Design a protein around this nucleic acid. Structure first.
Ligand SMILES: [Zn+2]
Length: 56
RNA sequence: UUUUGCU
């Protein structure tokens, strides 16, 4: 696959209180057990790799 | 809406 870093302006690095984000919690839905990267509410699947919807 | 969490 292709992967290239374009340009940047304001670097990222969010870190300032997270309620109680547990090491075994989700920072997406707020679920306990799965990770955000494993959140079943992620813009992935079942078919159609394209986040950020356009039409309602 | 929420990935603000090292492989
Ligand atoms: Zn989740």
């Amino acid at each position: 696959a292709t992967v290239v870093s374009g340009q940047k302006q304001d670097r990222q690095g969010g870190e300032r209180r997270r309620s109680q984000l547990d090491r075994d919690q989700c920072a997406y839905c707020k679920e306990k057990g799965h990770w955000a990267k494993d959140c079943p509410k992620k813009p992935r699947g079942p078919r159609g790799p394209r986040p950020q919807t356009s039409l309602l």
